[PDB]
């Protein structure tokens, strides 16, 4: 007897019962759900492309460990009674609604936004789940984080490589267990007055990031450090416990004061810049340049 | 009244008559055509992929202005009686036969080889039609041209950007009205003693081209000059007529001597190399560097 179900038609609603632990909705159209009786032992629920219906007054089974929202979903969620055992939550492309007053279940460990998520709302007043370990943002998120109470359970914080996030972070208070921080394309802010968590092992910067490292100090635990095409600042005071570094061919600074023991140095070959040609040009012709 | 036909089968030959001005031999048709009576006012003829049959003993109508050969066509043509009004001839990929005794009709203006044409035969003894204006070579053509009798009607000479053509050209007799010369990837020979035509407006060089321009004089008619990635020679005596120039980011020379009256200086960015960061790296760490 079957325990998985994909309700494509309106006919398939007669097919759901309490033996269904895996459910999929919204394959072909925005199926309304306000008056559906959910299976008592539902473990996974996936909302497909077309689904967009309010949920603030829908009681999902507390059995639900995994919930995925689809392309079209965009509704307020600050009023929702989340399942008690929800651990994994994924949000779709079109969802952009305030969550600053949401009541997370303390069982949530992973929160992921879609790669190109429209999500751009303030989060400085949020109460994170005490079990949150992984938080992944999308393309369009750009809000300050200097006054966010990160839970001590947080180990991984990731922005999409094409994130437009660019805010000051010098007054951020990181948790003591945060292992991985990954910034995106647009982040370029001073980091001299940042106290990184002593448990930090992986730190990744993006394209636009180019800041000085003369008054910076990194944790003794740092082992993986990557840089972007625009980073052209000297590296003298890197921690001697560093293991892997990554830089680009746009880097034109001396590397005599780098730590030993580095088991990998990755250089990323990028398309070269133009200054070395424009500088050796006649002044009256520098305005006549086309950069391809 | 249909005046257009595509022949795919032996049966379709019965659809031939004198009303057909546009004829196409189907992709799968590979049959002898020595005994075909061709439409009297045939204007355009196209052979598709699989056609490979002798044509020396075929008399195509004199009204045929546009003629095209397909992928598989590879047959001797030096004995062919070409139409009195042929203007546009195209050869396919697999065509590779001598053309030095061809007897072109004086109406031929345009001769094109397919992009990857295997055509590689000497042409120094050829008699060009007095109306040839545009001649385009393919990939594999590499034969001397210094002793070629070019017709004074030739305006455009092009090698494919991937051409393996690499021969001396310092003794070539360029026609007076030649206006566009484009060289391919592999051309790399001195041009110090080349007498460029006084009507030349466009000259393009390819990737491998790296020859000095100290003792070079270009016409006061030249407007467009292009160089490739390997070009790293100083440019101190370009004509004051030049309007557009193209270079790459691999150009490590000063350009203070560029002409005024330039309207556009195109700089193409290429993938940078790694040595400029390795030669400034701690000696004991250079071993473990990984290049991507």
For tokens 């002044």, what's the residue?
A283
* Cβ-proximal residues to A261 (8 Å cutoff; 6+ apart), any chain: A240, A241, A242, A243
Structure tokens at A105: 């279940």
Distance between CA atoms of residues A191 and A175, nearest Å: 17
Q: Rounded to a whole number, what is the distance in Å from the CA of B28 to chain A's nearest CA?
A: 43
> Which residues in chain A have Cβ-Cβ distances shorter than 8 Å to B263?
288
Distance between CA atoms of residues A277 and A85, nearest Å: 61
C-alpha distance across the termini of chain B, in Å: 63
> Which residues in chain B have Cβ-Cβ distances shorter than 8 Å to A278?
267
The closest alpha carbon to B102, from B125, B134, B79, belongs to B79
Q: What does the DSSP 8-state code read for residue A147?
A: T
**Strand pairing report for B88-91 and B66-68:** parallel
- The ranges assigned to domains in chain B are 1-141
Q: Chain B interface, mutation test: which of A227, A252, A292, most B Cβ atoms within 10 Å?
A: A292
Alpha carbon of residue A62 to chain centroid: 26
Q: Rounded to a whole number, what is the distance in Å from the CA of B49 to chain A's nearest CA?
A: 37
Helix (H, G, I), strand (E, B) or coil at A291: strand
Q: Which among B263, B264, B290 has CB closest to A265?
A: B290
> Which residues in chain B have Cβ-Cβ distances shorter than 8 Å to A269?
271-274, 291-292
The closest alpha carbon to B181, from B149, B205, B157, belongs to B157
Distance between CA atoms of residues B275 and B272, nearest Å: 10
Structure tokens at B181: 């010369």
Instruction: Name the resolution in angstroms.
Output: 2.7
Please, which residues bridge with residue B25 across strands? Answer: B7, B47
Q: Do A277 and B251 touch (CB under 8 A)?
A: yes
The residue in chain A having the minimum alpha-carbon distance to the alpha carbon of residue B290 is A266
* Cβ-proximal residues to B189 (8 Å cutoff; 6+ apart), any chain: B166, B167, B168, B169, B170, B211
Distance between CA atoms of residues B274 and A185, nearest Å: 23
- The experimental technique used to determine this model is X-ray
Q: Do A288 and B258 touch (CB under 8 A)?
A: no
Q: Does 3.30.750 match the CATH number of domain B1-141?
A: no
* Cβ-proximal residues to A10 (8 Å cutoff; 6+ apart), any chain: A31
The residue in chain B having the minimum alpha-carbon distance to the alpha carbon of residue A255 is B281
Name the B residues in 218-277 with CB < 8 Å from any A CB: 247, 249-256, 258, 260, 262-274, 276-277
């Amino acid at each position: 007897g079957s325990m998985t179900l994909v309700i494509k038609t309106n006919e398939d609603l007669n097919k759901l019962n309490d033996n269904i632990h895996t459910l999929t909705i919204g394959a072909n159209f925005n199926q309304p759900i306000e008056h559906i009786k959910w299976p008592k032992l539902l473990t996974t629920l996936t909302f497909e492309w077309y689904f967009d219906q309010p949920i603030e007054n829908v009681k999902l089974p507390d059995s639900l460990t995994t919930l995925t929202f689809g392309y079209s979903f965009n509704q307020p969620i600050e009023k929702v009674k989340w399942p008690k055992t929800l651990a994994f939550l994924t949000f779709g492309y079109k969802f952009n609604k305030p969550i600053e007053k949401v009541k997370w279940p303390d069982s949530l460990t992973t929160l992921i936004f879609e790669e190109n998520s429209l999500f751009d709302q303030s989060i400085e007043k949020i109460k994170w789940s005490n079990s949150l370990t992984t938080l992944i943002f999308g393309w369009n998120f750009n809000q300050p984080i200097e006054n966010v109470e990160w839970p001590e359970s947080l180990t991984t914080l990731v922005f999409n490589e094409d994130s437009i996030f660019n805010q000051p972070i010098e007054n951020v208070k990181w948790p003591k267990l945060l292992k991985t921080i990954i910034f995106g394309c647009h982040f370029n802010h001073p980091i001299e007055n940042v106290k990184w968590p002593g448990s930090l092992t992986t730190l990744i910067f993006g394209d636009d990031f180019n800041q000085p490292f003369e008054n910076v100090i990194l944790p003794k635990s740092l082992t993986n450090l990557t840089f972007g095409p625009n980073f052209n600042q000297p590296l003298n005071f890197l921690p001697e416990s560093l293991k892997n570094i990554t830089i680009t061919t746009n880097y034109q600074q001396n590397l005599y004061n780098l730590p030993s023991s580095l088991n990998c140095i990755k250089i990323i070959s990028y398309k070269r810049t133009y200054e070395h040609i424009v500088n050796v040009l006649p002044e009256h012709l520098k305005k006549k340049v086309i950069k391809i």
